[PDB]
Design a protein around this ligand. Structure first.
Ligand SMILES: CCCCCCCCCCCCCCCCCC(=O)OC[C@H](COP(=O)([O-])OCC(O)COP(=O)([O-])OC[C@@H](COC(=O)CCCCCCCCCCCCCCCCC)OC(=O)CCCCCCCCCCCCCCCCC)OC(=O)CCCCCCCCCCCCCCCCC
Ligand SMILES: CCCCCCCCCCCCCCCCCC(=O)OC[C@H](COP(=O)([O-])OCC(O)COP(=O)([O-])OC[C@@H](COC(=O)CCCCCCCCCCCCCCCCC)OC(=O)CCCCCCCCCCCCCCCCC)OC(=O)CCCCCCCCCCCCCCCCC
Ligand SMILES: CCCCCCCCCCCCCCCCCC(=O)OC[C@H](COP(=O)([O-])OCC(O)COP(=O)([O-])OC[C@@H](COC(=O)CCCCCCCCCCCCCCCCC)OC(=O)CCCCCCCCCCCCCCCCC)OC(=O)CCCCCCCCCCCCCCCCC
Ligand SMILES: CCCCCCCCCCCCCCCC(=O)OC[C@H](COP(=O)([O-])OCC[N+](C)(C)C)OC(=O)CCCCCCCCCCCCCCC
Ligand SMILES: CCCCCCCCCCCCCCCC(=O)OC[C@H](COP(=O)([O-])OCC[N+](C)(C)C)OC(=O)CCCCCCCCCCCCCCC
Ligand SMILES: CCCCCCCCCCCCCCCC(=O)OC[C@H](COP(=O)(O)OCCN)OC(=O)CCCCCCCCCCCCCCC
Ligand code: HEM
Ligand code: HEM
Ligand code: HEM
Ligand code: HEM
Ligand code: FES
Lengths: 171, 122, 60, 86, 66, 245, 387, 51, 49, 48, 97
């Protein structure tokens, strides 16, 4: 060693430590990149979203669009349906939900349009309560979208849509 | 089975021996086990009963010298070097220190290889 | 001081050794990322989409 | 414990199956005292030079293989031409 | 751009012998096909001459195609 | 066999993607995409490149969406069955020009225009062969003839290709104002096709450099440590004291 | 007694990886087994990952592979690593076989290890074919059609076996389903046979370049040979990463990026490069049954080696004739591969026939003759030295 | 295969109010009772009781 | 069991194609995992279950 | 059953999406399940 | 020495199947380990064949199973045997536990 002790030991341990540090740095990237292939691919991501242009639906009209296989209706409620929908007592519903918090904008009502009882396509602008009506099992959904009578257990589902000007993105 | 070298057949004719001596000298120089100091008889395989028995009938000094030779050869082969030109195995020390014992053991084994096959011709 | 303190702190117990290894790896990843990003950016001069945007986009 | 196995040639430490040794002395040094990469370039260069000199011709004469490759390729290309079908 | 340079190296002094061979062929083949025979062509000589011309022309015009 | 039935060897070029550290020249990519759309999309098909594959490479999101909104696609059943049409979206593939192989064969004599998604990687020569093919339509030599509908191209195997000369002078007007000739357009479209073959070149070449550097450093350190640890064996001394009886 | 020598599983690990006597002068050519194990592990993991995105059918396999390439997150790494590792596997296998052949490791007491290795080689060759036939490109379709038709050479039940393997009358959905199902199973059998390989080897230990007994000098494997293999591992990694990140389709022919058209016959129907010499041997013989017989024998002849070496020495370190003839055979093997790769033209037929003749002569005529000659020359010179 | 009366499920839903005639290939094995349930359903049409 | 009653261990709601809108009356796993499902539904809380 | 992974405090509701390979039970889920079901019995045999 | 006690593979087989000291009064409830092993072997062998006709895709998985059941030669045997063996595995597992 041509020198004193306690010096080559430090050098060798430093080389080993650099070895280990670089090996761990490589292994982390290897594992993360080779396991990230299990996440959502581009093809699946491209189908995730859905766009609806609300400018083509005037007040008191319905547009049916597709979103992940579940149709979702939009309705531009006039202040009338807004005010009777807010008038109903929450606790009197079969499934108690309000309406002020049920829609981000009270002039726009967007719900997932499948029968909550056995998964059928209801007909809108009908029923005893003036909303969506399911002739598959003879049940009626109110104008606000909730269930009033019939074999449907719970209310209609609400999508996680976001508003951007005149275009709404569903997803 | 076993090596079938036919040098005995060649040695019957002195013409062939005289012709082939330089070729044999060149071949033994080319094989190059002397560069490690080994004898030719250290390279034969020892994994059967005959050789393992023969190695137990060697004089003690011969066994110790063989052990030293093999250890030195291995230590040389570890670091990829050879002995200098003055320590190479001379032809005088390259004799057969294992062939007679192995031949005796093989003869004893062959001796028994006959009584079992014995038949009565009547 | 000298080289004894370095051994005493880092390479004395196994636990400190492993902790130093892991922290050094964590910082070395970022260092190599920065170095390769700089090298790649200086390698491609004038032939990237963000560089060539003002030759196509603005004249619409 | 388990069973008496067959006849092998390794054993383990202590009973390695080798011959009886006598009068052998071995020295060494601690790896933390010796300087690594000492006598490396000289020894490696000498060993490589010796290896090239001695086992060189056993490999060099890959020599006729390249020539037969080149001749075969050239002749095959020549025979697939206008003057090769005459 | 490329066709012009190809035509220049078609007659530049670096492919003169292959150009001469191509001309000799074309003369012979035109005469033979005029007589009536239809069993000879020199796509091979055209191949050689075209490769020479392209070797000349392509790199010296690919550096301007920006 | 005979070179007439094998095709003349292609011409070697130099491209930005050939360098060890360089990637892609994106202006040439946009020019090649324009040339393909306006001269090639009539007969060939590229049904493996989506509209979303272009945003960030040769177009932005708004430009890609506006371009894709022009074309029309079929959009499944609705209510009482039926098959309606819809404007294009940002997740649809490029529209093929022909419905099936039979229609494509019928339209262009009896030849089927091959799909161009992976034609650069599927040809012996790469970009060079395609570029030499597009700019190799010469007058037939002496002694050879061409049947009706067949064209002469030495680079094509057999020197007979059933594709009339696709590119001509000033066929397209590039946005940047480059003088569009046959050679420049051919080079740009070859670059675009090569991008379409392997669209991940930039990222792959970027990570390869860092991986190689780290591996080199680790290899050097490993060699040094191996040299260090094996010292007490490579430097032994053996002495034989002869056992005198 | 320490824990590592007491607990069963830890003792199993220790007896094979930590405490195991080894020859003290084994060169760098003894590391290829660890490289083979690492490559096999990489292949198993990568194949398991790739099986989560592949649909085994005629009309969906190629599209699934393309979707893997350009849509799945980091799919290009997966596919390129699988292909390049499968290519490197045969390189390391050939190097392992060459190491075993040069130093005469087939001799006793390691014959069982040699036979197990030969069986593993055959299984690996079979596994490679099914693996490459999956993407259903042009060469995969046509090469599978050509190769699976070789089963008709057996006398009796000739075309019945071909129909049973095809699951129909031509390469279609069922045969791809069969091939995908079988390609998953074979690597596990290969791993089990590798475990058998190691357990058969461990009973007697490794050899050394010198060729003499190594019982006098031994060192444990734990500190020394666990660090001599790291260099080879890192070198292999640096070799494979360059291919995966700068030339992924390196060993890959141009005709392997097109859909399988069953109407356009390609100009050349060739398998992957690592199977080329056996294809050349098969194509050399004009007869049909003789062709498949010779192709099988070209790999089955490695079992006849132990009873063909009449040499008192064990290896080629001190065998002047062996060193020459080994490299001659290697050159002949390379020539065979080159001939098999190219077209079956005029002169190439003669060259391939001559190369096949030499390949089958080397194993059957040259070895005994030169071993006997070396033994005779050495014995004569030693006998004629005292007088 | 035997011809399906409707080209897709949506046409079936449109024709028969809002219902959807289930496919009969594997209905017997997929109902709680099988043959007995199917026969009873077929032969069990009666006028409703009062209320 | 395989020659005289193959679907004898099988619930009747398994001979129908999966309709992602048809909500089944009862959602249960196979019989050999039933006790753990019973244990899971007992606890009113979610994570505790 | 797959929704039970949401009980994890921090990375909950993300492991579920990673396992699903999307937003609901679709083609990638079936592919992954087939591959894992093929793989696991050999591990079980080794454990036995 | 006997060959079964000498060859390493035959020694491994012998030490676990041929000559293994066992208690002399174990009842019939100690017979379920072999049953479990045989059931597992049957499951693996049958599943290898079952994987030869299955297409792993949500849109096309049920029709593949139906084709296995009613179109392949003796496919119903394969399907029923796989399902019923998977069921019997848990019965024998519970008995073992
Ligand atoms: C396919 C064909 C090959 C297949 C397999 C063949 C063998 C397998 C290759 C394994 C390589 C092992 C090896 O040599 O490396 C370990 C080797 C250590 O070996 P060792 O323990 O001394 O004993 C073995 C001797 O090398 C033995 O010494 P020797 O006396 O026998 O002399 C031989 C000497 C010869 O030395 C010389 O003649 C050179 C003299 C000056 C040295 C220059 C420095 C080289 C670095 O060998 C060397 O020095 C060569 C080392 C260079 C490593 C090369 C790495 C890649 C090559 C592997 C295969 C290549 C195929 C791919 C081809 C690519 C394109 C297709 O590493 C070194 O040489 C030490 C490097 C020190 C690094 C300093 C920086 C540290 C920073 C702090
Ligand atoms: C300064 C200038 C240049 C220095 C730069 C080199 C740096 C990197 C290279 C690494 C290196 O040489 O050191 C590592 C390495 C470290 O040494 P070592 O591994 O401890 O020593 C090994 C023995 O001691 C060596 O024992 P030996 O030399 O007494 O014995 C001769 C040696 C080889 O030596 C020679 O005779 C040739 C080397 C001559 C050098 C060039 C001469 C050209 C004139 O024998 C072998 O090792 C042959 C291996 C046996 C089979 C492996 C290959 C077979 C392929 C399989 C074919 C197909 C399979 C058929 C079966 C399938 C049928 C179904 O050095 C060598 O071994 C060098 C010998 C050649 C192996 C490496 C070749 C790679 C490229 C180097 C070309 C040389 C120029
Ligand atoms: C009167 C004349 C004619 C009468 C005929 C009546 C008809 C019977 C026909 C005979 C067919 C049965 C075959 C037969 O006799 O041989 C088998 C067997 C022959 O016995 P062995 O081979 O000598 O071995 C058993 C010893 O005798 C040991 O016997 P031991 O003296 O110790 O008796 C104790 C016995 C107590 O005695 C009894 O219980 C027998 C009383 C009635 C006898 C059977 C009539 C029904 O219990 C045991 O054997 C121990 C049970 C072992 C535990 C494993 C099973 C537990 C299942 C696990 C459930 C789930 C676990 C959850 C895991 C959680 C994981 C998350 O006969 C028996 O005595 C079997 C008894 C088993 C009781 C089963 C209880 C079911 C109720
Ligand atoms: C399944 C879990 C994997 C397994 C993940 C964990 C296992 C790591 C794999 C390598 C294991 C190497 C074991 C070597 C024996 C050992 O543990 O000793 C610790 C050595 C230093 O030991 P030393 O040389 O004797 O000095 C110590 C001096 N004292 C403190 C005692 C006074 O210090 C070292 O050995 C540091 C080695 C590098 C540690 C950094 C992590 C890098 C490995 C993880 C990332 C790569 C994973 C690759 C997997 C193929
Ligand atoms: C996550 C992947 C890696 C996960 C971690 C991977 C590494 C796991 C530990 C390494 C492998 C297990 C150790 C094997 C050797 C061993 O048994 O050491 C135990 C020693 C005593 O062993 P001994 O030297 O033989 O002395 C006892 C001899 N008597 C007195 C009994 C006769 O007793 C001791 O002093 C230490 C006992 C510790 C036993 C293991 C505890 C489990 C590890 C806890 C986590 C450690 C921190 C991990 C940080 C990364
Ligand atoms: C657990 C077992 C495997 C791990 C241990 C293997 C040994 C690793 C040794 C060091 C090699 C990597 C050093 C470079 C690190 C780096 O820089 O990678 C950088 C790149 C990504 O860069 P980025 O996205 O972070 O850029 C950030 C942008 N700003 O990653 C990669 O190229 C992928 C990893 C490839 C490395 C080859 C690994 C070969 C092992 C077999 C394949 C894996 C088997 C399956 C594993 C589940
Ligand atoms: C020694 C082991 C193995 C070898 C030699 C091997 C070899 C190959 C080869 C050569 C290919 C062709 C790839 C291409 O041409 O692009 C391939 C493809 C494939 N292999 Fe393997 N493989 C092995 C292990 C495995 C394992 C264990 C699995 C599954 C668990 C697997 C699954 C696949 C799949 C799904 C493909 C098709 C994907 C593709 O071709 O891109 N392989 N294999
Ligand atoms: C996956 C495949 C393989 C694995 C995992 C494997 C494993 C190993 C390992 C680690 C060694 C020790 C290194 C050595 O001695 O060279 C070894 C030795 C050996 N292998 Fe392999 N091997 C494989 C393939 C083969 C093949 C294909 C053959 C022969 C055709 C073979 C024949 C041998 C022989 C004869 C030895 C003993 C060499 C000696 O002791 O000198 N192996 N095997
Ligand atoms: C699943 C839960 C399991 C548990 C808790 C378990 C535990 C045990 C225990 C404690 C014993 C020793 C009993 C005694 O000596 O009195 C035993 C024996 C045995 N086990 Fe298991 N084991 C299980 C599964 C398996 C499996 C899956 C296999 C084979 C595939 C297996 C094969 C065996 C065999 C062959 C024996 C010895 C013979 C016998 O007891 O029948 N066991 N097991
Ligand atoms: C190599 C081993 C195995 C393979 C390749 C395999 C493969 C398969 C395949 C392809 C299916 C689909 C059945 C169909 O399409 O109709 C299936 C179903 C099934 N497997 Fe396996 N399996 C294996 C082992 C096992 C094991 C060890 C178990 C349980 C311990 C098991 C339990 C089941 C069950 C419960 C089903 C569903 C039953 C049904 O479909 O009716 N399998 N398996
Ligand atoms: S969908 Fe069931 S009654 Fe409305």
């Amino acid at each position: 060693t041509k020198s004193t002790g306690d010096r080559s030991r430090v050098i060798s341990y430093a080389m080993v430590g650099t070895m280990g540090a670089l090996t761990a740095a490589g292994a982390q990237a290897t594992v993360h990149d080779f396991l990230a292939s299990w996440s959502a691919s581009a093809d699946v991501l491209a189908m995730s979203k859905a766009e609806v242009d609300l400018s083509k639906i005037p007040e008191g009209k319905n547009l049916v669009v597709k979103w992940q296989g579940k149709p979702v209706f939009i309705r531009h409620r006039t202040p009338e349906e807004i005010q009777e929908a807010n008038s109903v007592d929450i606790s009197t519903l079969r499934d108690p939900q309000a309406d002020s918090d049920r829609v981000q904008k009270p002039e726009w009502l967007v719900m997932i349009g499948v029968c909550t009882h056995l998964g059928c396509v209801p007909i809108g602008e009908a029923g005893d309560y003036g909303g969506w009506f399911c002739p598959c099992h003879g049940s009626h959904y109110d104008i606000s979208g909730r269930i009033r009578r019939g074999p449907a257990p719970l209310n209609l589902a609400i999508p996680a849509y976001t508003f951007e000007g005149s275009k709404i993105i569903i997803g | 089975m076993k090596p079938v070298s036919l040098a005995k057949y060649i040695q019957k004719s002195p013409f062939l021996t005289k012709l082939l001596l330089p070729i044999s000298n060149a071949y033994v120089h080319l094989s190059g086990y002397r560069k490690y100091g080994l004898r030719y008889d250290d390279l034969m395989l020892e994994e059967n009963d005959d050789t393992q028995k023969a190695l137990s009938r060697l004089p003690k000094m011969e066994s110790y010298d063989r052990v030293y030779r093999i250890r030195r050869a291995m230590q040389l082969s570890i670091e990829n070097k050879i002995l200098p030109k003055s320590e190479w195995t001379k032809p005088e020390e390259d004799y057969h220190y294992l062939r007679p014992v192995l031949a005796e053991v093989i003869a004893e084994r062959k001796e028994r290889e006959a009584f079992d096959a014995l038949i009565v011709k009547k | 001081m000298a080289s004894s303190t370095i051994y005493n702190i880092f390479f004395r117990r196994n636990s400190s050794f492993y902790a130093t290894i892991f922290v050094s790896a964590f910082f070395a990843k970022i260092g190599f990322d920065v170095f390769t990003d700089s090298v790649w950016k200086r390698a491609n001069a004038g032939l990237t989409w963000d560089e060539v945007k003002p030759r196509f986009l603005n004249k619409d | 414990g388990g069973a008496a196995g067959g006849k092998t040639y390794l054993g383990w430490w202590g009973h390695l199956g080798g011959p009886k040794q006598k009068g052998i002395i071995t020295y060494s040094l601690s790896p933390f005292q010796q300087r690594p990469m000492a006598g490396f370039f000289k020894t490696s260069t000498q060993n490589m030079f010796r290896r090239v000199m001695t086992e060189g011709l056993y490999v060099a004469i890959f020599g006729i293989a390249y020539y037969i490759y080149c001749w075969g390729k050239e002749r095959n290309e020549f025979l697939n031409s206008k003057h090769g079908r005459h | 751009p490329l066709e012009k340079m190809t035509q220049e190296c078609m007659d530049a002094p670096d492919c003169k012998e292959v150009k001469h061979h191509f001309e000799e062929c074309t003369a012979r083949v035109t005469k033979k096909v005029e007589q009536g025979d239809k069993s000879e062509d020199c796509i091979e000589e055209f191949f050689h001459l075209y490769h020479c011309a392209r070797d000349c022309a392509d790199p010296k015009v690919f550096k301007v195609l920006v | 066999g005979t070179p007439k039935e094998e095709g003349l060897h292609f011409i070697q070029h130099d491209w930005p993607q050939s360098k060890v550290l360089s990637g892609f020249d994106h202006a040439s990519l946009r020019r090649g995409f324009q040339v393909y759309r306006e001269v090639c999309s009539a007969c060939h098909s590229l049904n493996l490149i989506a509209w979303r594959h272009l945003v960030g490479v040769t177009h932005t999101a708004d430009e890609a969406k506006q371009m894709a909104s022009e074309v029309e696609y079929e959009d499944g059943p609705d209510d009482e069955g039926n098959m309606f049409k819809r404007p294009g979206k940002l997740s649809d593939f490029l529209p093929p020009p022909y419905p099936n192989v039979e229609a494509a064969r019928a339209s262009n004599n009896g030849a089927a225009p091959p799909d161009l998604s992976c034609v650069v990687r599927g040809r012996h020569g790469g970009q060079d062969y395609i570029y030499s093919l597009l700019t190799g339509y010469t007058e037939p030599p002496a002694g050879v003839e061409v049947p009706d509908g067949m064209n002469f191209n030495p680079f094509f195997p057999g020197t007979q290709i059933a594709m009339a000369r696709p590119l001509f002078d000033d066929a397209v007007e590039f946005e940047d104002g480059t003088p569009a000739t046959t050679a420049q357009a051919a080079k740009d479209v070859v670059n675009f096709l090569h991008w379409a073959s392997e669209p991940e070149l930039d990222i792959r070449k970027k990570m390869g450099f860092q991986v190689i550097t780290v591996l080199t450093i680790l290899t050097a350190l490993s060699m040094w440590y191996k040299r260090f640890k094996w010292t007490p064996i490579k430097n032994r001394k053996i002495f034989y004291q002869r056992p005198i009886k | 007694m320490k824990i590592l020598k007491s607990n069963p599983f830890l003792a199993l690990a220790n007896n094979y990886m930590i405490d195991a006597p080894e020859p003290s002068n084994i060169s760098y050519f003894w590391n290829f087994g660890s490289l083979l194990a690492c490559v096999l592990v990489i292949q198993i993991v990568i194949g398991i990952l790739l099986a989560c995105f592949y649909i085994p059918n005629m009309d969906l396999a190629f599209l699934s592979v393309e979707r893997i390439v350009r849509d799945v997150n980091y799919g290009f790494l997966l596919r390129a690593f699988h292909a390049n590792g499968a290519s490197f596997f045969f390189i390391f296998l050939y190097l392992h076989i060459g190491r075993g052949l040069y130093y005469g490791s087939y001799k006793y007491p390691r014959t069982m290890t040699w036979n197990i290795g030969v069986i593993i080689f055959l299984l690996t060759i079979i596994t490679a074919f099914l693996g490459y036939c999956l993407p259903a490109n042009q060469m995969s379709f046509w090469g599978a059609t050509v190769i699976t038709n070789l089963l008709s050479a057996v006398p009796f039940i000739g075309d019945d076996l071909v129909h049973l393997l095809w699951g129909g009358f031509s390469v279609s959905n069922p045969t791809l389903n069969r091939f995908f199902s079988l390609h998953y199973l074979m690597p596990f059998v290969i791993a089990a046979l590798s475990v058998m390989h190691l357990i058969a080897l461990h009973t007697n230990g490794s050899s050394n370049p010198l060729g003499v007994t190594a019982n006098m000098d031994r060192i444990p494997m734990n500190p020394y040979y666990l660090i001599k293999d790291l260099i080879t591992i890192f070198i292999f990694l640096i070799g494979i990463n360059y291919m995966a990140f700068y030339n992924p389709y390196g060993f890959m022919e141009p005709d392997c990026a097109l859909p399988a058209d069953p109407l356009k016959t390609p100009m050349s129907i060739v398998p992957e490069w690592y199977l080329l010499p056996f294809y050349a041997i098969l194509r050399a013989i004009p007869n049909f049954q003789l062709g498949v017989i010779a192709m099988l024998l070209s790999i089955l002849v490695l079992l006849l080696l132990p009873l063909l070496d009449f040499s008192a020495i064990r290896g080629n370190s001190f065998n002047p004739f062996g060193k020459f003839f080994f490299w001659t055979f290697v050159a002949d093997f390379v020539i065979l591969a080159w001939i098999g790769g190219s077209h079956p033209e005029n002169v190439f037929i003669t060259i391939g026939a001559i190369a096949t003749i030499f390949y089958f002569s080397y194993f059957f005529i040259l070895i005994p003759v030169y071993t006997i000659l070396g033994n005779t020359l050495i014995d004569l010179n030693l006998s004629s030295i005292k007088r």
